[PDB]
A paper describes a structure:
CYP154C5 from Nocardia farcinica is a P450 monooxygenase able to hydroxylate a range of steroids with high regio‐ and stereoselectivity at the 16α‐position.
Hence, the crystal structure alone cannot explain the observed hydroxylation of 5α‐androstan‐3‐one in 15α‐position. This way, predicted NAC percentages of 0.31 % for C15 and 15.8 % for C16 were obtained.
Numbering used by the authors: 4 to 409
The structure:
């Protein structure tokens, strides 16, 4: 492969390890190309922390030079990750906190202890599915039977999505994220998803229930109520984020522990906490690869570099998790005993830091020990090295996870 000053992100994810290494080497700020569209990539831990609190980088797409000039339009296959309805995801400044508060309040750890019985029930239900699927030593897809449905069940219970609509949502998201989806079909799926969530908020407005979507609609606290667009916007972000990332976290942790048996023993024998094994997974093999996208409202001088006004800036969180300056020379290794396991920023940093990190950590802390307690000899039916990524450029999405129960 020839040398180039712009690092093209392969949409097929054929060499993720090599790409992540090249990003780190060319960092901590590099030029990248996203399906023919240029941007900058932040690949250093320290510089990411600084820029994630810099008020001169905004989420609003109208600040993008290439959106203003009309050179990037809705035909860009990744536009559904950026040009979205108004929500906590797209707002900065004082307006942002108003759109986050009820969600952060609902997602505090102690508030989540009321949801913990539900998580435990779904984990138990889907392990029963695993037991039936894996009878007579048959090969079982851990993703389809267990890891893929569980987070959609949990987030649906929190937000109020009916049990009978979840398979359709999953089908829509798979099309939304896959780069093979024809662009005209992807934009219609986005419109169909918007339509569903719009009617869901109108149904919850007329008949509220014990869920967060009703709390966003009502529960004013004395401040200006959220607009219909804002409620729908937060609902869409929460379901999309709450499902996509957690499926990856569950699967990557199982793969990391099954490929490092000595470390799986440490958490099963109670010498290292399962929570620590989860943090090292987030640092080393976390759900987000690249986070689109931030835009400079003015020129940002970084000493020996300048982010021009209007430039798009991506947070390459996977490369950031392999930061050798922060984690040492063995940063590319999975090691749940490392002293910097919980110092990652895989949930982000600054105002837009993930509001559901406590829920993500709770789902994994329940599912993982329950899986290995139920199936103590679970092992891969396919070499773990050969499980491919789905063609989703921005997310760490595994295709299928063939196992034997043992
Ligand atoms: C499972 C592991 C998860 C990871 C690794 C993760 C990662 C992230 C990151 C890195 C961001 C912000 C990116 C940035 O602004 O630079 C974010 C935002 C967000 N996440 Fe999480 N997430 C996870 C789980 C969840 C869950 C369970 C939920 C919902 C309960 C959730 C809901 C959200 C929302 C609504 C935002 C947007 C917040 C804002 O922009 O102010 N995520 N997530
Ligand atoms: C990048 C993530 C993982 C962490 C945050 C997620 C996005 C939140 C906003 C919503 C907003 C949407 O209606 C589309 C999906 C989107 C961009 C999420 C995609 C997946
Ligand atoms: Cl060069």
């Amino acid at each position: 492969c020839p040398h180039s000053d712009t690092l093209t992100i392969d949409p097929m994810i054929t060499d993720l390890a090599g790409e992540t290494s090249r990003l780190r080497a060319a960092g901590p700020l590099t030029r990248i190309d996203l399906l023919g569209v240029p941007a900058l990539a932040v690949t250093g831990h320290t510089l990411a922390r600084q820029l994630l609190t810099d008020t001169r980088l905004v989420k609003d797409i109208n600040a993008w030079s290439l959106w203003q000039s009309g050179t990037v339009t809705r035909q860009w296959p990744l536009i559904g990750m950026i040009d979205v309805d108004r929500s906590m995801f797209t707002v900065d400044g004082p307006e942002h906190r108003r759109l986050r508060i009820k969600t952060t309040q609902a997602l505090t750890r102690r508030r989540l202890d009321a949801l913990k019985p539900t998580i435990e029930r779904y984990v138990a239900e889907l392990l029963d599915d695993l037991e039936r699927a894996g009878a007579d030593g048959a090969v079982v897809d851990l993703k389809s039977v267990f890891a893929y449905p569980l987070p959609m069940r949990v987030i649906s219970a929190l937000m109020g999505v009916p049990s009978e609509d979840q398979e359709q949502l999953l089908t829509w998201y798979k099309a939304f994220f896959s780069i093979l989806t024809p662009q005209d079909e992807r934009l219609r799926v986005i419109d169909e998803m918007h339509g569903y969530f719009t009617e869901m908020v109108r149904r919850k407005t007329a008949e509220p229930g014990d869920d967060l979507t009703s709390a966003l609609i009502y529960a004013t606290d004395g401040e200006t109520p959220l607009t219909e667009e804002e409620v729908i916007g937060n609902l869409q972000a929460l379901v999309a984020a709450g499902h996509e990332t957690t499926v990856s976290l569950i699967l990557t942790a199982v793969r990391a522990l099954l490929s490092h048996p000595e470390q799986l023993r440490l958490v099963r024998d109670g010498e290292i906490g399962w929570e620590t094994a989860i943090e090292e997974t987030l640092r080393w093999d976390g759900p987000v690869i690249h986070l689109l996208m931030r835009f400079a409202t003015e020129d940002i001088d970084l000493g020996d570099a300048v982010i021009p006004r209007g430039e798009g800036v991506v947070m390459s969180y996977r490369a950031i998790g392999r930061d050798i300056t922060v984690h040492g020379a063995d940063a590319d290794d999975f090691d749940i005993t490392r002293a910097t396991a919980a110092r990652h920023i895989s949930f982000g940093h600054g105002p837009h830091i993930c509001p559901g990190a406590a829920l993500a950590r709770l789902e994994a802390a329940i599912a993982l020990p329950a899986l290995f307690t139920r199936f103590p000899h679970l092992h891969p039916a396919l070499p773990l090295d050969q499980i491919p990524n789905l063609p989703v450029l921005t997310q760490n999405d595994l295709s299928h996870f063939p196992i034997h129960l043992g």
